[PDB]
């Protein structure tokens, strides 16, 4: 599925994004777990990405594969295409 990092992203804006993404037909989740195979950050540094990955390790079964640790660029590409876009190097940190 797809999960969104609410901090530094705004709760109302995140809710709007989740609504438009679920109306797009693809599975979006509100809670941090391991089912979501795609999680988009908000121009966060790589070390902050690692710290949030550790926090996800806390709030998810240990040893599970990480989701798609991409940035807003891939999200906007996928929304513009109306479907998931192939992942590129500029997306992940």
């Amino acid at each position: 599925a797809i999960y969104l990092v609410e901090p530094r992203m705004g709760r109302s804006r995140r809710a709007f994004l989740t609504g438009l993404a679920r109306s797009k037909g693809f599975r979006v989740l509100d809670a941090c777990s391991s089912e979501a195979t795609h999680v988009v950050m908000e121009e966060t540094s790589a070390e902050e990405a690692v710290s949030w990955q550790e926090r996800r390790m806390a709030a998810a079964p240990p040893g599970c594969t990480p989701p798609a640790l991409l940035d807003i660029s891939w999200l906007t590409e996928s929304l513009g295409a109306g479907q998931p876009v192939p992942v590129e190097c500029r997306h992940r940190l």
Partner: protein, 532 residues
């Protein structure tokens, strides 16, 4: 009924294409001035309707055809609301011709068009403008009929030529320096007109005088001076709605009065909406407001948990809009009351505040109020007195304080009001005494040099046959170049979308620049001062 219908008479005679080297053709100059006029018409989104007639046309088209009468004349565009179609028609579709026709026939057909097409439409004013050479052969045998019919129809007229009227100054006679379009300097002298031109000038002059006394002479302009005035819009003005009030002294004395916004800083009336760079739509882009704590966590804030407040030095006092409504100061409706009177010298020009200047007459159709206000004006004049007045537009208005002084003209007399500032508005400072500066004392030679510079760089010449000073640079008649530049850019973009912004035309610089003689005189003194 607030609309208005106008007719534009264009010459495409063989003389229109004829031009003097270094000078634009009359055809092209009139084309440019009408382009400016229609730009102001369309881009202000006015409801005025326009018709366009051509005389001297190689072809001919009009309902008044027959024989050779009203031939070589084409009604290029009928009377209706403007659009960019006629704009591009003037841009490229309008071409000069080689034939000639009687402009009286053009006036006749335009008046007939007004008689016929305006049926079913109710305007406020009717106006026609004419551009011609005066050197075209014509016939003059129905003038009285034309004058009587147009007076019966009550339609104003206006004339523009590639030359100004008879003058003996340096602005109507070709002096030193080349003639420039739109400048404040010389124009065509009494050396380029023809005998036919003199004949046509006499005809139009007698028409103008028989219509409107001496003022009819004023309604004749050259293209260059028309480019720097609003005379083309002089016949389509919309009078501002009068603002009434009751001037009062004490609780006893009251005079009903009417005021107008005499001087107001204008402004464009179309915001620049931001749209998509691709779909060119504003709706598909959403504007939102961010609410976060003044902290490092940047926690989002719900709008409900937000309450307004105000800073009071050290502290911040919370507040609510109901509190605002309940303890805000409230005036007493509208008000125009005289606090008293003070010497004219006591009030200085620098203290004027506000973005507006009001001019006040007595209440319309009130002889008693009129004579009372006139006597008050005369008393103020004789006593060198100005009245402090507390102004209030209405109940919701902020109570302003200001000054009002008499202003007597030949045609009327009024009270001119300008808002004065409260003591909080003042910000005083100190500076160095330049007249006694110990290090900036200029030499006497520097004083003589700057005196020569001032003498050479005068913008107003004192005529001495009547001993009256004539201003050589009237800025109050120059329009705002901002609107003209905006119109030019919008037109260029509309006609051509894949080109950069067009450059500013020469006449725009000429209208904004002083007469060349001023620069020529200032040449030597400027360099002399530069050595200091």
């Amino acid at each position: 009924g607030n609309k208005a219908a106008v007719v534009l008479c264009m010459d495409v005679g063989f003389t229109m294409s004829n031009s003097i080297p270094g000078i634009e053709s009359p055809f092209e100059q009139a084309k440019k001035v009408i382009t400016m006029f229609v730009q102001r018409q369309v881009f202000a989104e006015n409801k005025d309707e326009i018709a366009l007639v051509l005389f001297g046309t190689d072809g001919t088209d009009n309902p008044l055809s027959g024989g050779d009468q009203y031939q070589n004349i084409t009604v290029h565009r009928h009377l209706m609301l403007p659009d960019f179609d006629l704009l591009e028609d003037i841009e490229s579709k309008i071409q000069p011709g080689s034939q000639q026709a009687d402009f009286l026939d053009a006036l006749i057909v335009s008046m007939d068009v007004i008689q016929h097409e305006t049926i079913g439409k109710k305007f406020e004013k009717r106006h026609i403008e004419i551009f011609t050479d005066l050197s075209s052969r014509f016939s003059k045998s129905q003038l009285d009929i034309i004058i009587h019919s147009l007076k019966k129809c009550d339609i104003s007229l206006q004339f523009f030529l590639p030359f100004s009227l008879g003058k003996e100054d340096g602005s109507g006679d070709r002096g030193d320096g080349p003639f420039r379009l739109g400048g404040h300097g010389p124009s065509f002298p009494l050396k380029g007109i023809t005998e036919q031109q003199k004949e046509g000038l006499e005809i139009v002059k007698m028409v103008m005088i028989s219509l409107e006394g001496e003022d009819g002479l004023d309604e004749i302009y050259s293209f260059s001076e028309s480019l720097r005035k609003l005379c083309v819009f002089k016949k389509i003005e919309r009078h501002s709605i009068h603002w009434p009030c009751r001037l009062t002294i004490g609780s006893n004395l009251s005079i009903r009065i009417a005021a107008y916004k005499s001087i107001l800083q204008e402004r464009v009336k179309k915001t620049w909406t931001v749209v998509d760079a691709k779909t060119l739509k504003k709706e598909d882009i959403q504007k939102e407001t961010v609410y976060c704590l003044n902290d490092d966590d940047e926690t989002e804030v719900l709008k409900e948990d937000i309450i307004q407040g105000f800073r009071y030095g050290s502290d911040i006092v919370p507040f609510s809009k109901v509190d605002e409504e309940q303890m805000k100061y409230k005036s007493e409706g509208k008000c125009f009351s005289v606090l008293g009177f003070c010497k004219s010298s006591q009030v200085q020009r620098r203290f004027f505040m506000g973005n507006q200047v009001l001019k006040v007459f007595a209440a319309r159709d009130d002889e008693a109020a009129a004579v009372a206000l006139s006597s008050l004006i005369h008393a103020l004049d004789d006593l060198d007195m100005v009245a402090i007045v507390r102004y209030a537009y209405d109940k919701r208005a902020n109570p302003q304080v200001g000054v009002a002084f008499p202003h007597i003209k030949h045609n009327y007399e009024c009270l001119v009001y300008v808002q004065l500032p409260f003591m909080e508005d003042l910000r005083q400072y100190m500076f160095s005494s330049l007249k006694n500066s110990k290090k900036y004392a200029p030499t006497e030679a520097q004083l003589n040099a700057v005196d020569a510079l001032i003498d050479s760089m005068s913008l107003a010449k004192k005529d001495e046959k009547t001993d009256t000073l004539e201003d050589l640079f009237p800025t109050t008649k120059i329009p705002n170049p901002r609107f003209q530049r905006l119109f030019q850019c919008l037109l260029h973009r509309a006609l051509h979308p894949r080109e950069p912004l067009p450059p500013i035309q020469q006449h725009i610089w000429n209208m904004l620049n002083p007469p060349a003689e001023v620069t020529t005189k200032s040449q030597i003194p400027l360099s002399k001062i530069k050595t200091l």
